[PDB]
Amino acid sequence: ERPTFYRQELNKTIWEVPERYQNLSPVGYGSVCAAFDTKTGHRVAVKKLSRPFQSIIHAKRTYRELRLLKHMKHENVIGLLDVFTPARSLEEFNDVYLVTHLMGADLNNIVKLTDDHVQFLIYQILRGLKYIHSADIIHRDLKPSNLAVNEDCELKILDFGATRWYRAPEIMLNWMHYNQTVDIWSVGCIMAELLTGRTLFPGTDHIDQLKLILRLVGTPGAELLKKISSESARNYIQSLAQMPKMNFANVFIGANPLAVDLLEKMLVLDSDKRITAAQALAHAYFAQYHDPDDEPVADPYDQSFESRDLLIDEWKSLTYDEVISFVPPPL
């Protein structure tokens, strides 16, 4: 049947939740409350989406995030525990509440890591990425604050929705060729940081960010230069590669040589040549955790809504239907 809801005001916001969610306490992320889930005995996070149907773009953003979260059924990716609305009908349908595990510990919050803990943490990012990538989805904003890590170094990829530090150079140069390996660049930047204890490319702006990248990875080779249409774009990328060249051996002095080999395959300017998540999992660096029988891919994900231009009401109707058809994961 439909649960009993109860109403309170917090941080001058009206919350209306099923009575199984008790002891709501605001945290930090927009409108988010820690809550005790009386059904399981476990603490969860309840998020009330802000102005979910305000515009076409918010409405599609609401739909997008619900469709994505409902799809994610993987150890190393945030899962959706519950979604609800107070509305008894599409007529009254206005607010959308998502329930997740309580994270409140990101990759920075947890780092001074041994080689073994870098292996396990980068292993879990790549296992999660393999999954997300297999369903034709790109994170685009992988960075330490978007990685939940509990006491036992267990890692989930999520998106709380400085980015430029972990951002692939092709995106900041506005190159044509984009692929899922923009996420691998990011993983390379995260791994480098876990090894050295400092941001690899702490640019103050996108031009500084690119100059710092090119100092390490080098000016484009003949092969890459071949794929760039514009003389002014080929001049400019060569323009930004004038800081005295650096070498990977020196930057990662004292790292496991296998880590350094894997970094050199991730931090490749030519995204056509960048190692994929599935290939990185098979690299010797992860021999202690790699199991080809336990690195699963995602079920097919229907992205055919991403290309659509629809009215607010259509986005809201599709969203309502996804709330109603939601089936909780097992206890």
Active site residues: 159
C-beta closer to ligand OE5: residue 32 or 217: 32
**Residue 47 Cβ vs ligand OE5, minimum distance, rounded to whole Å:** 4
Contacting residue, 83, 149, 157, 281, with ligand OE5 by CB under 6 A:
157
Contacting residue, 35, 72, 240, 263, with ligand OE5 by CB under 6 A:
72
Tokens linked to 148: 């939940």
**Residue 180 Cβ vs ligand OE5, minimum distance, rounded to whole Å:** 12
**Residue 169 Cβ vs ligand OE5, minimum distance, rounded to whole Å:** 22
C-beta closer to ligand OE5: residue 285 or 315: 315
Contacting residue, 15, 18, 21, 32, with ligand OE5 by CB under 6 A:
32
29 is in an annotated binding site: yes
254 is in an annotated binding site: no
C-beta closer to ligand OE5: residue 160 or 289: 160
C-alpha 175/C-alpha 196 separation (Å) is: 30
Going along the chain, which residue ranges are E strands? Answer: 5-10, 13-18, 21-26, 32-37, 42-48, 82-84, 97-101, 147-149, 155-157
Tokens linked to 140: 């685009």
Count of residues that interact with ligand OE5, criterion CB under 6 A: 26
C-alpha 42/C-alpha 35 separation (Å) is: 9
C-alpha 331/C-alpha 310 separation (Å) is: 37
70 is in an annotated binding site: no
* Binding residues for ligand OE5 restricted to 74-103, rule: CB under 6 A: 77-78, 98, 100, 102-103
Give the alpha-carbon dihedral of 256, 262, 264, 267, to 10 degrees: -120
Contacting residue, 48, 60, 139, 316, with ligand OE5 by CB under 6 A:
139
Tokens linked to 152: 């036992």
Got the DSSP string for 150-196? Answer: -TT--EEE-----GGGG--HHHHHT-S---TTHHHHHHHHHHHHHHH
Q: Which residues bind ligand OE5 (CB under 6 A)?
A: 27-29, 32, 45, 47, 61, 64-65, 68-69, 72, 77-78, 98, 100, 102-104, 137, 139, 157-161
